[PDB]
Design a protein around this motif. Structure first.
Motif, short mmCIF file in Angstrom:
data_model
loop_
_atom_site.label_atom_id
_atom_site.label_comp_id
_atom_site.label_asym_id
_atom_site.label_seq_id
_atom_site.Cartn_x
_atom_site.Cartn_y
_atom_site.Cartn_z
N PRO A 149 0.87 -1.17 0.00
CA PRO A 149 0.00 0.00 0.00
C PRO A 149 0.93 1.24 0.00
O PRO A 149 2.05 1.19 0.52
CB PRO A 149 -0.70 -0.03 1.36
CG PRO A 149 0.24 -0.80 2.28
CD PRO A 149 1.05 -1.72 1.37
N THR A 150 0.52 2.36 -0.57
CA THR A 150 1.38 3.54 -0.52
C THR A 150 0.80 4.52 0.51
O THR A 150 -0.35 4.39 0.91
CB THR A 150 1.44 4.24 -1.87
OG1 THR A 150 0.25 4.99 -2.06
CG2 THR A 150 1.63 3.22 -2.99
N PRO A 151 1.54 5.53 0.92
CA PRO A 151 1.00 6.46 1.91
C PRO A 151 -0.24 7.21 1.50
O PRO A 151 -1.04 7.55 2.35
CB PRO A 151 2.11 7.43 2.28
CG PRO A 151 3.40 6.72 1.87
CD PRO A 151 3.00 5.73 0.78
N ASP A 152 -0.37 7.44 0.20
CA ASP A 152 -1.52 8.15 -0.35
C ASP A 152 -2.65 7.19 -0.61
O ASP A 152 -3.56 7.49 -1.37
CB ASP A 152 -1.18 8.90 -1.65
CG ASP A 152 -0.29 10.09 -1.41
OD1 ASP A 152 -0.71 11.17 -1.06
OD2 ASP A 152 0.98 9.83 -1.60
N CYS A 171 -2.69 4.47 -2.31
CA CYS A 171 -2.71 3.78 -3.58
C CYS A 171 -2.11 2.36 -3.36
O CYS A 171 -1.63 2.01 -2.28
CB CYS A 171 -1.84 4.54 -4.59
SG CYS A 171 -2.57 6.11 -5.15
N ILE A 182 0.74 -0.28 -4.96
CA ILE A 182 1.83 -0.40 -5.90
C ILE A 182 2.28 -1.86 -5.97
O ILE A 182 2.38 -2.53 -4.95
CB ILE A 182 2.95 0.59 -5.68
CG1 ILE A 182 3.87 0.56 -6.87
CG2 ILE A 182 3.74 0.27 -4.42
CD1 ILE A 182 4.89 1.67 -6.75
N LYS A 224 -4.99 3.20 -8.21
CA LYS A 224 -5.74 4.21 -7.51
C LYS A 224 -7.25 3.95 -7.59
O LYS A 224 -7.84 3.59 -8.65
CB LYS A 224 -5.43 5.59 -8.02
CG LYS A 224 -5.74 6.64 -6.96
CD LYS A 224 -5.80 8.03 -7.54
CE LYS A 224 -5.52 9.09 -6.49
NZ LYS A 224 -5.26 10.42 -7.08
#
Lengths: 125, 121
Positions: free
Chosen positions: A74-77, A79, A81, A105
């Motif tokens: 998971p990404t910080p925003d 999303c 990846i 996204k």
């Protein structure tokens, strides 16, 4: 509770993308948006339109992918990846290795691909 | 060269230089909440990351980048993708794939996500 959501979404996405890729790449436009970016063998394409034309234009007739490994995070925003490693078999060409990356996204209750990078592994001659 | 390529190139240069020279110093490019997937195994947070890296069993390592791709994302990050080779100590040369997600925080670029995989013959 077992499998994290990003694992679930990433994995299913990957599977859906290659199926589409391997059966009718013209349908690939569905997973991209206008602001999507594609880097294919070092070449960059901006926007759903240019991306689909490029993929539709590949000189292969029959293509088949095989995944050796896939990793998702998971990404910080918020999303998702993913990094994919695998092999490709097109027509009568020799089997090639590749690496692919996707950035997902959630838009409109849907997971779309905003960034896609693909690069082939060359044989050291 | 586009702005994102300039940033990506530097970051990688920075990263491998540290890796190949003082790996205990890699913490400098991560944040507390960074995430690392190394050969399929997950390392969460700076502390776990740094220990993992510092603890690798070889003494000397050297990397060479064969290809590097960079892209900007809609939310101001940068994705850097690399393919290369490395030689650790006296072992044979191994192929590798590495990917980074860079974010601008406190005015500087740091790595929030890192995925690494060795290539198979």
């Amino acid at each position: 509770g077992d499998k994290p959501i990003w694992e679930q979404i990433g994995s299913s996405f990957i599977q859906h993308y290659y199926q589409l890729f391997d059966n009718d790449r013209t349908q690939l436009g569905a997973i991209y948006i206008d602001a999507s970016c594609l880097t294919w063998e070092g070449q960059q394409f901006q926007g759903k339109a240019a991306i689909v034309e490029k993929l539709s234009s590949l000189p292969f007739q029959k293509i088949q992918h095989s995944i050796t490994a896939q990793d998702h995070q998971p990404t910080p925003d918020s999303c998702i990846i993913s990094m994919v490693v695998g092999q490709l078999k097109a027509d009568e060409d020799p089997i090639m290795g590749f690496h692919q990356m996707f950035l997902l996204k959630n838009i409109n209750d849907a997971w779309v691909c905003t960034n896609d990078m693909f690069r082939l592994a060359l044989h050291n001659f």
